[PDB]
Assembly symmetry: D2
């Protein structure tokens, strides 16, 4: 039986397991240090391709709203941003495989300029994991072929979402003020 | 206690409940009809803003890969696409509130041209729900303020992901061929 | 003297010469045939990177408004679209160098699927020019280093703009109706 | 006669006149002050919709390459960035009409936060011109209906291109270093 109800139930379980297996790997002490490193960044570049780029943009929209300076989709433009990073800036490199040439190149360029590279990647030995100062692991679990990318994205978002909440915690008043101003402005477009 | 471990556990539960409550509302017979309507569309426009736009782009990348003609982010460009739709085309309008003026306007324009409007929206009585030919419900559950948008996105993706798998089912051989050709091409960029 | 007034005068002359030298190469009989090929395309993909991608998006917004089905920035997504093109579809490949691996790969994939490839590229012997069924030449002229990309873009837009006007000519009534509907809709967002 | 050769000749003249009439309005002393204000900005947001957004992105890619921190297309995201600007940051608001509600709202929000607003807009009395600290004028000239948007874009790019060259002048060594690093990186993707 391959009914839509069976598919929905199986996919929700696949996503639950990706959330569980990804969370199980977290080093929470080290995650807090990563959050503080991001909070001090004068500029943050989030890199990625495909679904990983969308995960990165989803985080970027929230970071922008709460006041971070965040760099877009074009891989060659991304390379130009990476070479312009400076000491204290942060690159968040989102790549499940950790082996996309464009993302590896941007991580190499950012590190060479003295920026801090934080990789969000699968639990595998990749060029990106070898370049990053810190790596946060994303595990999709054993997925069915039709839903591999969706469960991967679920795992990736579980990490970026936690980064966002941790950043809100460090600057709660300003975050609340900026959320309120943002809501007031967009409500004027109704 | 507001430790990162507590936050992660609570957020994963919030997401599990959003998946559960969204799936519980599905009419699976009607979902199959919606999937078949999409499968016959000569052109599909996916509309949305903010996080809903990212959910839509995530679905769009997968639909493009398996051969669908899919329309981008600019709300005024979206309006120009909506007025150019024709009978048989489909608009998938993704808006949790269902009350963003730009999205409502695009749905009105698409319907006027004879296109089919499928809304993906919260369980509320909105202008978008009143304009759509079919509505699929997305329920975030009762969320904490720091994670409301993330659990909403989880619920939205649960619906779009099911649409994707249902579309693969209807054209499995061609979908597999296109996935293979796509993988071969992108591997050449390694 | 490197005053802003001198810079502005020199840049305007550089752009005038790029328009002139690009127009001088046009084969107008062959351009009309290219326009008719585009007008018959059930689906059009416009590929490019960097500034060439922006030139392509500028054309795409206008084509969408007048009713064409047009495919975005992600180079790996572009590859997935190219492999899904069919006989009768058109790829407009915009690349000044004609040697960006991603664009060459997409042109190869489109041609393999039977689609028609129209290259918009510099007057040089490139892999893209060798793959295209038709090539339209864009000449920047001899540019100063600070403005090379701007004069290149001016030349590229001179070709795409002519394609747009030629397409309006072939379907003038429908184009006017769609422009009016588009204007009416966007004015409602004022 | 409405041949493609006649169209091309007329469009090139229309563009030449837009460059001429836009340049004729420049106050070069005030332009130099605007360039210096931009050069000191810790963060620059470029706003716009439609073709104006593409003009802004074209400038943004160049500014990013030479080291500026630059904010994207979503109008509601743009609003969230505008409310997060600070004293010393710059908003470059590109809108020919100067009356798009989204752009006016972002300019109001940026000014309220103490940021400097530079408008690039038509020679008309608009809400945006009334909000901006500095306005640079873009004149399309008297255009034919089929090419109004293209000549407008030509005029807009003439202003942004001059801003870019002026910024290169103020930091020539660093600009050259960053151009070289950028070229070396992207050549590795060949
Ligand atoms: C046809 C294909 O496989 N496209 C893939 C796409 O699915 C994938 O999301 C993207 C990014 O991958 P990553 O997370 O860096 O490992 O890389 C593209 O190449
Ligand atoms: C500052 C704010 O509230 N921005 C919101 C953004 O969070 C939200 O994702 C976007 C779309 O909303 P919808 O799903 O259509 O109800 O609408 C914007 O206005
Ligand atoms: C640092 C650099 O050179 N970036 C370039 C960018 O300027 C250029 O617009 C883009 C596309 O080039 P093309 O028109 O295909 O020859 O390719 C990037 O690599
Ligand atoms: C159907 C239509 O008119 N779309 C327009 C588009 O052509 C235009 O580029 C965009 C921005 O205008 P602006 O430069 O701010 O005056 O505003 C949209 O509404």
């Amino acid at each position: 039986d391959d009914s839509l109800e069976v598919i929905a139930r199986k996919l929700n379980r696949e996503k639950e397991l990706a959330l569980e297996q990804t969370c199980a790997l977290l080093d929470y002490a080290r995650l807090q240090k990563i959050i503080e490193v991001i909070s001090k960044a004068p500029f943050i570049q989030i890199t990625g391709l495909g679904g990983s780029a969308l995960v990165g943009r989803d985080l970027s929209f929230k970071l922008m709203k709460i006041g971070y300076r965040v760099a877009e989709a074009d891989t060659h433009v991304q390379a130009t941003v990476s070479q312009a990073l400076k000491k204290g800036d942060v690159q968040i490199a989102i790549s499940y495989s950790g082996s996309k040439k464009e993302i590896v190149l941007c991580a190499e360029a950012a590190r060479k300029q003295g920026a801090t590279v934080i990789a969000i990647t699968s639990l595998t030995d990749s060029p990106l994991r070898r370049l990053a100062h810190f790596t946060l692991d994303t595990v999709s679990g054993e997925t069915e072929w039709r839903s591999s990318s969706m469960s991967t994205r679920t795992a990736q978002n579980s990490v970026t979402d936690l980064l966002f909440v941790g950043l809100v915690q460090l600057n709660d008043v300003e975050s609340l003020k900026m959320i309120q101003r943002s809501s007031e402005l967009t409500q004027r477009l109704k």
